[PDB]
Amino acid sequence: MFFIKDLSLNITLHPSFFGPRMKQYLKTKLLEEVEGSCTGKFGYILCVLDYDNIDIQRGRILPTDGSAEFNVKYRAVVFKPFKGEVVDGTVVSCSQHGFEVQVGPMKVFVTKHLMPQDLTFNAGSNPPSYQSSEDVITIKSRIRVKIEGCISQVSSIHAIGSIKEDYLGAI
């Protein structure tokens, strides 16, 4: 879910970049390393605001290697869900065990035990989908999934959701 947060990072600048243009190198390093990353403490790093207003701190030369470490604070827009969240998304792949829904930059999987029995798997259809009396769900179909759990690793967060209750499926 999109939110604005205050973030900080420690960036090490190599001694070979020690010149009058160090601020430019720091800005390039920050933009090239932070944007698009994922942190389990704050979710995916989507965007950074006020690029011209980057805050900086005085260097502190490390005693072992000579690389100057800097502390940079900024404000960023990030995405992270919570337990019990309901989100609309796009069906990615269809399987017999369930389905996968892309929401934002993340994937939420639903197992066949997590939908009502009225939705039946049709493999002969192109592409294979889930068909019911009222709702049909397939590729590029907007589907609402109630996220139940999330697993966070260094570079990504996976999710598992359920649509077992009513008012779920095609919109």
Partner: protein, 169 residues
């Protein structure tokens, strides 16, 4: 966040770098897409200004005729501002563009005014801006926080007005 369990990291009250408490800010697909597009075009303009310092066309990007032309402008913007090293940003931007409920800034402002005039939680407001529900009960079930907090007539009125506000493509 069925029970509005946002945790410490996403508290309603945020402490900024100035030390003053602020309301937590939540943006739907339209608001986030507009903000990121504005930031990217501003960064491109700053880059062009810097290049001119070392040594018109920007009005066509923000105003897009069609979804495909908007996507092409988005690809050009990513090529000229991002470098093509960030695939996750491209995927997020494509997801925003394909399923953006509202394309015009004024209509997005109208949606924001309609949703936050009642003073609901920012999470609920952003969810309503992201989700288009035909009936009030559908939204109430799909948004458990909205239960017991908003009258059904008000929710039906808001949903019908939002559905009417959707710009035809």
């Amino acid at each position: 966040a069925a029970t509005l369990q946002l945790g410490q990291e996403f508290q309603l009250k945020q402490i900024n770098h100035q030390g003053e408490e602020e309301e937590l800010i939540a943006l739907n697909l339209s608001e986030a897409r507009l903000v990121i597009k504005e930031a990217l075009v501003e960064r491109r303009r700053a880059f062009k200004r810097s290049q001119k310092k070392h040594k018109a066309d920007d009005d066509d990007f923000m105003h897009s005729e069609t979804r495909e032309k908007e996507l092409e402008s988005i690809d050009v913007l990513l090529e000229q501002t991002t470098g093509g090293n960030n695939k996750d940003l491209k995927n997020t931007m494509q997801y925003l563009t394909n399923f953006s409920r509202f394309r015009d800034q004024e209509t997005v402002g109208a949606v924001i005014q309609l949703l936050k005039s009642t003073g609901l939680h920012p999470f609920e407001v952003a969810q309503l801006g992201s989700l288009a529900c035909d009936t009030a009960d559908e939204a109430k079930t799909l948004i458990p926080s909205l239960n017991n907090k908003i009258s059904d007539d008000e929710l039906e009125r808001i949903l019908k007005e939002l559905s009417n506000l959707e710009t035809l493509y």
